[model samples]
Target: NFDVAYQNPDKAIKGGNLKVAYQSDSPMKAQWLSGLSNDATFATMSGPGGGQDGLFFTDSGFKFIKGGAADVALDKESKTATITLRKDLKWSDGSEVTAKDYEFTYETIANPAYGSDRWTDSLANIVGLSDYHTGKAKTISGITFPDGENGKVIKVQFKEMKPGMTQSGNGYFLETVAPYQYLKDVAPKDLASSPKTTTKPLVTGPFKPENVVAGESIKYVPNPYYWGEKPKLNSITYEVVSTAKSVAALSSSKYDIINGMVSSQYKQVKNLKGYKVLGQQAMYISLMYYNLGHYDAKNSINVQDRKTPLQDQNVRQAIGYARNVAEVDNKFSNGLSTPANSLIPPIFKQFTSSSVKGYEKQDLDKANKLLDEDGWKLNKSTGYREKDGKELSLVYAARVGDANAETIAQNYIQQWKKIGVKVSLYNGKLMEFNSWVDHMTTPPGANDWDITDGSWSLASEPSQQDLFSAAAPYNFGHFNDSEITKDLNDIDSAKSENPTYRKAAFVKYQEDMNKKAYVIPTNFMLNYTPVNKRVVGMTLDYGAMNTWSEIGVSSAKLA
Candidate 1:
């Protein structure tokens, strides 16, 4: 019934092709160009490539590890950072990785023609970046090549010292370094779909792409020019498969590794005869975003619609109180998830604050009272609240394939209906990803939806300035508050030596988010994967820095 592949466990060696499966079709482009639309699939298919390396990497415990491809030093007095690239690092084409690559990455991301609305926010904290972004400066003044052009060392000067500048702190300024030689001629608008990005682009990872089947699969072989220990596997193939068929496919020996196993299938898959399940708490949190935009005549989508009731703070607070997030987690998640109370997940224990309110427990009485105080009174005719002839009705937009999210949305509708709030669900189809991004980033006049289910997988660092800042592109809710913005800025500006100040600022951020009811905290799932018994050194506990495909082939033993 079953055949084992390894003959001698002690004498096990590498040189076999491994099969893996991803949940979606391959995203054959770089992550920044696609803007996270297909990042999960792309990251799984391609191991960490050139330009993806950072100053530090994380371990299974989510702690930072030094000795990355670059060496970093911070000067507290002058608020400057010096980064040096490793002399031996090379791309797949055997070209040296150097400072010009880093400069190219920064210039491309900051250029207006790239059309990337959400570049790293910390880039602006470096001097002259604002002017560079505004097209006033021909070159970034803060960045300098200390050892001359094309050298390995680059120096960066910041306007202020930030905790993220030091190695001990959980933050970094320069994260990516793309190849200047390969991507120099590619136009900014055409970068995402170019052959250099979508197909066999030069990389600096453990493996290089040997073959890519576009929407179907990708085949990678050990990279001859890789700077790290030679990978154990000779080749690895990542294929696309639907969640409904993943367990069956694994059982039939169609896949050696399943990338993102859904929580609902955990029990059945683990019970299968020849596999073991691995799990860990990931840095991702599912959330509910409430839109508070008022109608504007000049807006594209809002021109024909009325302003939503979510514009009122009390209305949003009541909705938060009415949510039964804990129940949804317990019943649907098979006890694998825990209710979230703060914007930051519990995995980052040092930065997470438990001082927030209205998230730990649901109180319908408080929900009703808040609505009543806000002048929304129940009409006997329809059993729903009404204020000035407008019914307290809202629409929710969510993805199609997420079973847990669909269940939670339905539960929310039922719970809010009992409290005189009518909720409507909208399951977007076709270009759902692009449409959702447009709705979130467009101005108020172009937006009409009230609530949307969303999630964020944060960086190893604990900075939320990009997500919560009023002017940042990822602020989907358009949430704006002067105090919260200032405190967030203060956290970003704090020196690495001042831990107390940063921690207190984080606490204030959590408290303000809860008080304003900008979002409803849902739950965090323990990241898990089931693998065949022949596989060894396969652990889901590795931090987000080590992607599944990268670590899977590099560490797997056939015994």
Candidate 2:
């Protein structure tokens, strides 16, 4: 009986304790501590401190947009930015949010002791940030608060005018301001670990944490000092539920909302008695990455210590040819996910390429031909291809807890087996949720996996430089192609401002990725969540970050 359009706030009934479920345990105590990396932390801290008038806010598509808590103006000729904060904005503690707070956030993140990679790297374009980050300067000369406004405005000068200046996805201009008055005494090294980060920090979001059970759940209450219209719900609680039991919990009415619903369960949940199932094609992709070089000899798992076979382009292309992404989509994603052909998802219409191909169907003959041409001949005795007496066995790993990932891996293994490729699945502690990132990113060892299933959710923009550039730390595949590198750099340095130029560069990047096959394209994520009919005024967005933070739970009504 779910036939309502969008919820109207005028009909909102307040004072309910809304319950939400997450598939994984909540990690991280506060948004400031981890820069909002943890889902639990973002759900609790972002809305209050991260709103348009709080510090920063993203549009429905998760793109950085102006007119949240601050107003922004860019001067192209001078490569400078002016950000003016709204007057009368106060933290949960009733202290006015000032420019000094923004300065403090900059200083702490730029300090060498903090080791903040994303924030520091994104802001490196600022003129004096490098010198300050390197400890050559006591203060960032490029950032200054205009004298007359009483710390309401901050001016930032960049080293050069780059295309990312106007793009919110670059995160070059939107900085989450921190409270200097409350945090000045905490040591930079201890800030993340301190209890103050979660329990006692000042914030300007619509709500604040009333109770937190580390790795379990968070209980939030409306902030008395919230500047916007007071939230309708008295409180919101985010609790962790196992992926296997999440849908059941929703069916039983144990939760008002459930995030990250498994795609395979969409059919079951869509018709649940009292819930509305909303779905959107998110700005993310589930794919497999092939390691090229960077393997350490000491940690070699192969007794013979053979070099990584994936370094061969033909071998990588063979694996790509063997993948049946449509099958995975149908069996695991309930046909909700789009079979991906390129790195860029189709959601970003301007940047998505229309010409890239060859990842949709399985071509076992093509895979076999490529493997044979590359010297991996079928070994009759073992029923697997071999070259130089070494079997063409590849180690594949996928994150634990994702039921779909396990199924997708199994499908790939079965397909590859038919092509005479031996697949060795890694079953280890790599399923420790966040620890999976370390497994993928750790400097490659001989023991390192040859291929792994993973996914990435990017900001609304199609910015790939920080992800694929040769020097990028997040380049988990260890891929380095001179042509791809140049195109990415050009997009960052010259074309970011011009939509046409940026789209062209991204098109080339996608074409190159299709040809190289460093990453075997799988599926573009189609995210679905179940919301109880009683919870009105809820909105669904493309990314998890946007969906969780911007949903107007304050306007929800209990039946």
Candidate 3:
């Protein structure tokens, strides 16, 4: 019967809710919301977290199966992009979905008044976007949909033309074009407080949020007027589960799906009946971060006491060569993870592993030689480097109980010891980890760190602009170099398809990044979300975002 617990082929329930459990310290917004409504979640599910650093949203997934399909074309020499929209597309409420939605989302995202932190860098690359953002222009001169066209065509101008310039996994224009005419008066700030009462929240996708109870749950109903096959499920709700209590709730059948399995508790429930295990490696990674400018008056080993050890390239490379990444990854994850050599993980197609140098294994002798040449003298008896009666020591910090995070760091501590470098591991909560990282990025006086564990998601376009862009408010370590800045700008403005040229440019970027040694990667865990055997025809697409349109309630009966 359709009422049975297992899926059946011929029965149709029409609509029902699926129970899911997840944990999040922050609230859900378009930046964090996952659903089939757009490309972000779908693309993330299709690619490695949809090929962005982790399980976030992407543009490719949003356009596929939505009204944006086959609508965009790229022109290299002109450095411009064009998007054509289908005329038949309409929002759930029957309002026409047009090119203006595309213009509004793009322009609004670039608008300084809206304060969209994520895509400003991307929008800045489009011609006239900067002027529009800076308020120097009333309308973007570079963008035009053309006159009397049946479908709206949005145009984007580039700074240069290169290969693969026109083709991207995600649709650039359609991904953000929710009905701006409907949302213009709503404002960005107020939506955060009350997403439920925000009205229809006009969207040209497969589903829309029907009801949302602040902090309780969000209910999304299928968009009856969706351009594609109407969703089979009537509704889906997202409920937040605190980190500390999620596991028990998962085993008790309180939730049909849980986002993360808490690495430490994997063994405990791997054999749970009626449940399955999916070991999909994730695009996420943990790393050790070091501030270039820091000195402790109390600790004579402080690099600031000397000539600033962080400024030395040899010292930075020595640190990379000092730790054994593979051994550390296994030590903490029991072979459930992949060791990371650079900030960009292997999942990113553009990330070439060989580009990152000096990350193979621990090189204690070389480490010691570099340190000795930098004024640190090794004490044969105690095996600690000393300079002017002060012994060289390092302080590393990370969030506590993140098993792999702490254990991997401790492994480094043991390795640094052989090089006559003392290592101190500071354990703290999430807030403490944030405070520590914040200190490393600010002015030297406020900074009081040597190394700490962290990670960053590079954009899918393979642009390292955010990490090293000049005046980048997000620049973490004060490791500023002109060449790195040049590469970032070139990656943005220069378009090239020659494998060798792109690889060389990116390799130079990685090498320059390593010169700072601000971050050293540990591992990239595959993201996995296991479902019941009865659940079939469910595709785990890109953007690591989940949606209701692609899922249905099966009619199969339980055995």
Candidate 4:
């Protein structure tokens, strides 16, 4: 056994023999390599290039290690979580890790000249960050970090808090950009181009990028100057593989770690020995959309008739009552999901049992009664629900070849049909599905389809303004409610952690959305990954995608 401790490496160069195999959809190029010299160590990584969750380092880790409903930390008044950084920390180039690095990172990304996608709405919580980002201020006057020598003199200026500040701030967004000392001469836009690069990209983690072949594979090696515990495996090599070939490659041990395992691969690899299976809860929510404007009387298709079924709230209530959520979850998913009654998951502290109104359970009788009250008569001969001589028909559209989504949509169609509502299916490519949703979200009214299905990646903040913003391109159904907007704005402006207050606001927001039937909740499920048993001490944290850094691998050998 090797000495495994989170101690200062000092000057020891621990060598090891290990190999890691990975499958990626696209090849990686040297440009993507965050400036590191070759040393031969490697590890396999998949997914898009950007933040290296398992391999890279952040200024201070994001407050939330993983994004979820659970409250990792909550302080009622000040609304801030206490944080600590690792002692044995050093950049790949041997620069001492400090607070200045973090400040520079924040300013560089937020600079308009850089055009970084990251500084948008996410980092608006940092004090003076918005002003600096909008060009209204020359610099951030507030941002605190402890003085390495005087630990008690903790730093930070008085500033408003943002949602998801606790974990997200420390985790995905933690890497501190180098001091402006190194960036002033090199324009941010030119940082990514050419051999003239002066400063080597630095990380306080175990490994660094060595060589990358565009869309092919990325080669990594141990950081000769790493400050903390060295990696067990000397190097990691990530290679891209086709989606269809992922299963066969894993069975043959062609790769040591593989992510995004499809449902079909479950049976093939589940029975295999010498492998460990990790189930992950994806940070996305699936739901159905309804166009509120189209249903309102002001823009109803039949203005002269004065009898639009959608004008009746009972009709919306009836649709909600008619759904059998559990049945749909079972028929579509592989028993790996939970039916969501409210927009927020049960795991989140904001979810109040009493907040959700409308149908939690299926009741055909109640559905029929509501429809009848709304002047929808069940035609005995035709087996269709009709209102004032107009049959209720809806078109359900979803991405084609998405077996799970397609199956669930079909199930909903059958359930609605049973209640005398005519539902038709429109299957198309993923892009077409996107196009349909996009057209519907545009001004005037969403006319692409009656009902469409999609998912939203949940954040630790639980602020729905981004999802429901009137100007949000993602608001597919065009369902606008001023009350929902007000609640969202309030939550966005509120402090980071105040369980009682935040929960109250969230409860009201969900209640308003439910009453309008703007979006229907489906189920939240876990994503899966397969890893070789030979690698030890590596554990994937919930709400995160990888674990090569936090996890210590023993006798790790990658070839």
Pick the TM-score winner: 2
lDDT of 3 by residue, 1-559 (tens): 0011223243445565555545544433332211112323222221111111111133431212322322556665566766666656665577766667667665545665555554544455567777887889888776777742224666767654544343342223224455555566766555323342232245455566565444445456666776556666666555656667766665665665556556776655466654555555444655655565433324411232323455567767677778887776566665465666665665554545655763656677888788878888888888888888887776665554456655656677888887788878553323255565565444333444566666665444544554545544344444556676687665544444554566566666666666566556665665545454434334444432344455654533311
lDDT of 4 at 137: 92
TM-scores, all candidates, are: 0.75, 0.78, 0.75, 0.75
Best by lDDT: 2
Worst 10 residues of 1 by lDDT: 1-10
Q: Candidate 4, residues 1-559: lDDT per residue as tens digits?
A: 1121222222222443333444444443333222221211222242222233122321212234422111233343554433333343445565554556545566656776754445556456555767888889997655555564212121344345555444343322333334334445767677555332221444444566565555466566776665444555566666667777887777777766675566656657776765666665555567766655432334422111122354466776777778887776566555456566677764454434444754557888888888887788989998898977889977666654445665666677788878889878654423365565555544445454666677777764445655776556456665556776787775655542454675677777777777777677765656666666555544445333334433333433432
**TM-score, structure 1 vs. true:** 0.75
Question: What count of clashes does model 3 give?
Answer: 37
Compute the lDDT of residue 29 as modeled in candidate 1. 40
Residue-by-residue lDDT tens digits, candidate 1, 461-480: 65777677765556666666
Q: Candidate 4's error at 57, in angstroms?
A: 11
All models: lDDT? 0.68, 0.68, 0.54, 0.54
- Superposed by TM-score, candidate 4 places the C-alpha of residue 558 at a distance from the truth, in angstroms, of 9.6
